[PDB]
Ligand binder design. Structure first.
Ligand SMILES: COc1ccccc1S(=O)(=O)Nc1ccc2c(c1)CN(C)C(=O)N2
Ligand code: NA
Length: 124
């Protein structure tokens, strides 16, 4: 039932880059998912305590969320767009691993993932 430390959004010895694809990821891909009606459960690390998911971090070993991704993009944390896309991917996959098909949270993820894949297709 306890919360690990959240994923790092800074790392001084990690090599950083600003690519036009990273800037799109923040301006278009994240900005869009963030405003969606189903974004709220993914805007911060899962709080296993408040949300009574005491098995969450017993099951999910690579947690990720949009609050973390957003800060990482804001902190120029990534080397390339693929690293960032990978964090979105981890976020979705965790949801599908942890919860059951037909859970409301799964239908939420599923709608953001459809939207995500549509906005990523238009990646410059
Ligand atoms: C039943 O609780 C919920 C159902 C749908 C959406 C959100 C909630 S909750 O925020 O009250 N609790 C919740 C319940 C389950 C999850 C999560 C949150 C977050 N998450 C990423 C996950 O994978 N499972
Ligand atoms: Na650098």
């Amino acid at each position: 039932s306890m919360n690990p430390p959240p994923p790092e959004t800074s790392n001084p010895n990690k090599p950083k880059r600003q690519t036009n694809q990273l800037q799109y990821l923040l301006r278009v891909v994240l900005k869009t998912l963030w405003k969606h009606q189903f974004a709220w459960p993914f805007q911060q690390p899962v709080d296993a305590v408040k949300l009574n998911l005491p098995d969450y971090y017993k099951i999910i070993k690579t947690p990720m969320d949009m609050g973390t991704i957003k800060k990482r993009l804001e902190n120029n944390y990534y080397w390339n767009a693929q690293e960032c896309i990978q964090d979105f991917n981890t976020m979705f996959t965790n949801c599908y691993i942890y919860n059951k098909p037909g859970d409301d949270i799964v239908l939420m993820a599923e709608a953001l993932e459809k939207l995500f894949l549509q906005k990523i297709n238009e990646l410059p």
